[PDB]
Symmetry: T
Subunit: 150 residues, 12 copies
């Protein structure tokens, strides 16, 4: 693994994640609908911007971002599933949180890799993204009645 391969893997992950955010946005039901429906728009924008920043950082270090759905599905470690039967709001937020934790943990691996390779800019970028992910994990775990690392 080198930095280019890591960033491209995250281009794929973030495209799967933003589509998942839309799935949750569209299908959610329950008393917290109005608040969490809007919250998903905030996350969609934020992680869409993460995705563009990752892709353009990859461009700037001489790489070539994945840029088709086929490539995203071939490379993403984030999982997706069609919405077939009704899920509770908690179940949807557990799927969201689980994907946030996955991104956190993979970003930590990219932070270590970019440090080893001496790519200070990419390292810094990933740290800033992790800071936001860690905050989201605390808040969505709190919604679920749980501690952030529980």
């Amino acid at each position: 693994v080198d930095t280019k391969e890591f960033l491209n893997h995250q281009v794929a992950n973030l495209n799967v994640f933003t589509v998942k955010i839309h799935q949750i946005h569209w299908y959610m039901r329950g008393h917290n609908f109005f608040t969490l429906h809007e919250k998903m728009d905030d996350l969609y924008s934020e992680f869409g911007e993460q995705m563009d920043e990752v892709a353009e950082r990859l461009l700037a270090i001489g790489g070539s971002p994945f840029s088709t759905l086929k490539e995203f599905l071939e490379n993403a470690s984030v999982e997706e599933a069609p919405y077939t039967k009704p899920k509770t709001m908690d179940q949807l937020m557990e799927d969201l949180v689980g994907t946030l934790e996955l991104l956190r943990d993979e970003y930590k691996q990219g932070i270590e890799l970019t440090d080893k390779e001496g790519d200070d800019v990419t390292n810094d970028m990933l740290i800033a993204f992790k800071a936001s992910i860690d905050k989201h994990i605390w808040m969505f775990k709190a919604f679920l009645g749980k501690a952030p690392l529980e």
Copy 2:
């Protein structure tokens, strides 16, 4: 074909199209880079909003939008291809225009279908989207040195 099936087909198309817009945004080169790079961000936002409006109109008429990359690829008539060898700006804009024309022509079919079924709201929505697509076709054809229907 009924209105629900038509709208869901366009959810799939618009997700393939916005990813294609990003492909063009990222990989373009040439003297018009700064203008068209920004222009692609405008289109990305606009057609992303079309997509959300289509999906939520589908929800509001009792339908269930596709919400995974797998479903989008299974259903889209918009085509995608990985970016492997360098394309000129004109070639990228021809791919863009060709997809705009496809969406125009399929939206016209949805306009006829929703009129036949008496779904006035969906009909009106599609007409408004076609108005913007037709304007884009004129402008991007003009960039290419061509008439809008040439």
Copy 3:
């Protein structure tokens, strides 16, 4: 008059002036009396709806003026003509009961607007037709979202 048998764009629009005035007062009733854990979100949401349907009401009344009509403009007339129903708040209602009343009235307006859409189409009043379709688009979106709050599908 009954919208379902309604024959006349002017009559239909005036009926909706009455309806929308009853509806905005109902939105305030819900805004004021609601209790429960979703209070802060739904209290503000009712302010959004109050503004939106008040604007619908002004647009309907002024479209009626523009086609040569005379809008109802007193509480007496609104009560004499509205098919939207109201009731004084006497005993406690749960948030779900309040939202069910809201959704039921949205469905009534949706269905009456669809009657007006057909009527204006047949009479060739393209502007009024287009106006009502835009209003229905918003109502349909609200019905989906408030049904979702209630744990239900939009047309369930």
Copy 4:
């Protein structure tokens, strides 16, 4: 009459008044149409906000606001009449001014009542509303060519 009863009476009055403002807004004709049509929108907003503040102050002191057209008509002292025959702009503004004077004088009674009962917050709220009403009375009387209190 205690403070709760007084405030509820004004909830009723203000709902009759805002409908009257719309009657004037809709039916007015004459050379001052454009200015006064917009001015009525300003008043409609202002007295609608007074109405909500009165109702919510009533809630905060343990009361229950009237919340139906039926209740507003049964309790309002503000008068209304359907628009049957043409009225001049001056006649419409005379009706507006007459109602502003009614509200002014009733708010003065409410100011005295709340001072007697020790409800400092409600007292302060009513004084602020009267301040605006007094200003409107001066300006609309001036429009009519008259002194504010003549």
Copy 5:
């Protein structure tokens, strides 16, 4: 007639109309000067935007808009006359209203024409423009002390 010919006729009409609006803006006198002078600026912007939208819709369906004063005069049904003698504010507003009614009635013909030809986008555009014209006719007739269709 076909849709292209109709739209080009309105390009000509709207260019004559915006100049007429400026004529009224510049030469008006009377007590309502300040309000109506500014109101004509509002109309000038609005109908200038209608004109650009009509011309660019014409482009988008493969047409070629008139684009010279000579062509506008050769094709407009809206009439113009030099300001050679004093006119009252009522006379100027009667001229404005008459031209609004002419445009309303021609847009109605274009609405019927585009419906028959199946040009849903152009049909929708013309309806939106008629909606605004109908509102202006009510308001300016009210200024003149008249009912909208009087």
Copy 6:
């Protein structure tokens, strides 16, 4: 010490500087530790309250300066003088429990502000009297809304 025995306006205002500093820290405690389905709404709502009561505190302190007083300005002084109580967050609290603590403190401030309104009216300090009434107006509105969240009437 006790606001019910406040000798004068200066002492009363300084007591509220102390109270409001304890209260804004309690608002942060609730903001940070809350959990439950209403988290996103109430977490933001606590930021609104923190700003508002922080501004009340600065206004009280600067009014005290303007009448020749000297505001408390250390944590030690705030703790020596506040009647608002605080406790470290040890065992978990439900969202409703946190909101009950918030409402209880709002009621305490309401009732002490009422004492200060009566005191300043007696002393003829019209400006301070008016300031306290405006603050009470907001507190009364908050009590209604947070009681509604809890499913209760405002004075229940």
Copy 7:
């Protein structure tokens, strides 16, 4: 440079009398055009108050000392004022406003010639800009009165 200084100071005095007159009209006007003209006077009050500050601060920048008391304004202004004793019609109030605008126009024209003769390009340019606005106001308020700008 004393002639330019004296001219600018005379206009500090004029503009302070004028803004008070604008308030007089703003406060006492009655009639059907009240709402439009009441607000219009607020626009004029702001604009001519800003002219006044610009004039005074230009005077400072060329080494002068602006009049800065009501007593001095009255001792020096050529703009006239009168207490409001009996009601005036809206047209009468607008005629007074227009007359004062014409007075300022004509005195500024004198100041434009004076500053050109003295070679004070900055002050000359400032006065031309003010006259441009005054000329526009004269056209618009004359039109309100049913009149041509210079008739």
Copy 8:
């Protein structure tokens, strides 16, 4: 109601003298605190000009007739003015400003008692709000001078 009317009109006169004094300070000040206090005077000019318009329009709304000429302001104001003849230090200018703020504070206190006695709740409330701001300014400008607010 004539006592409330007379009080408000007296304050129309005072505030017109005061805003001109604020301009005097704004224009003539010199010293190291120039940039901050020059801008601060613009804030005060706007605020007390708005108080003046609010006072005059409240007077109109209770049936009164505001003074509306420099002559009337001078005949009635208790705020004093003096031509700027010899340079003053920045501290001296701020002492004059503070003294005038204290004058307005104390007269408003009288007006607050008067309107309470006459039962004019609206005017009473307006004056209290103005006094609140004046009291804050007195604290801040006294602090600038190194002094306590009431010392």
Copy 9:
């Protein structure tokens, strides 16, 4: 007729009312018919110019009113008096050709405004003189920038 023979300021300004109305229509012609790789930038740029020269036109007309004149106010009058030329769009023009036509018209207006500056200076109309200088300043900047687009020096 010819600005080089303009008898007075009123006649000159009215000639420019005519010129600017022909010019804004030409700007729209270019805006609508342009094709080529610089389309998106120059299509928007023509909207900027249309607004700016439309404002110049209104300023010229209202200055003419303020000095006792009577602006041309019909297409017929504009065509009878303009020295700016127009032609229908028939055969295709390149973007560079359209920009050459634009620059040529800017140069015409520059040179006529210079005549009006000299005329108003002679007549002592300081306000109109100043207005025309400000307009020339913008035209000179546009000539530099559009000549640069064409690969040329401003006065080449």
Copy 10:
């Protein structure tokens, strides 16, 4: 020490510091009053935001922030004292600068600590806060006529 303990210590410090900022804001006198009174409002907001960011970072790593005045006093190394006698503006600013230097030096220790523990996000947060403190130290030292590290 570990990262959680360090961050909680700074929650305590920052709550003592914001109260000290208010002390200076309220009691300052002298010719620089207007500028420095407003400047303390800027600092109050900034360090209040640092405090919330520190507390919420602590939450996001599984910690529990101090949340009472009692705990803040038990744990802060920033010192406070009642305002009992007149201080010059220089004295107040010397107290401010001394506390900024204390915070700078403790943040340096936390930067080293979080680096050693591998908490990249917390490390990055503390560096950004130190950057602002270092700038303030230069500017307030300049106010006092001193070099930044004098």
Copy 11:
């Protein structure tokens, strides 16, 4: 000296002046630090804009602006010196005022020159700049306790 040579001389002057403004911005100390540090940013922006407008006016009259530090130093009459020993705030403001006076007096020569040559646009531009310089001279002299021209 013709207009082109004069304008180019001021391009050089203004580049030396903006660097001097930064020197003062960076090195100033004393009780007026916060106010004057920000004031220097205002001046830096203003005279940078003057410089660009001068250069672009020179372009529009067929000239070629100096565009290197070497050229600016060879042509500027504004003087510069490295900051070697401490200067008081008053000394720094005296240097600023002295340079403003230099620019004022040179712009006056340029105003005379452009009037002689008939360059009305350049003449007008220089007068506007002098207007601002004259205002700054009054205000900074006032800061120093002096009359504007003494």
Copy 12:
């Protein structure tokens, strides 16, 4: 001094103060003299870069102040110390040549900032290190975009 052998954070930062002043003047050179069909877009783009790198320059100088240094503050010193090169504009340059000069200078700054990033890391100046990384991130993005304009890959 030579950044590549640079030993001292203060020396490195001051060297970049000099560089950034030469660079912003070069950006103006390009802004003023450019010609060609991309004029309107790249003329504005140079304004963006001028503001951005001027802000970098102020941030570098003030970081140097904050660590006890003394920024160069005269054109003489900037020329004595900059490694960024400048040349008078004498003969015409194509837009591509101007953009090649821009890109070459961006690459020089990138590579010198990387030297400063390593130096500040070794010295333990975390704040200066973080500042330089943020600046490099922007420079790297510009290099990609301007190379794309030139038809080249970012590191080609």
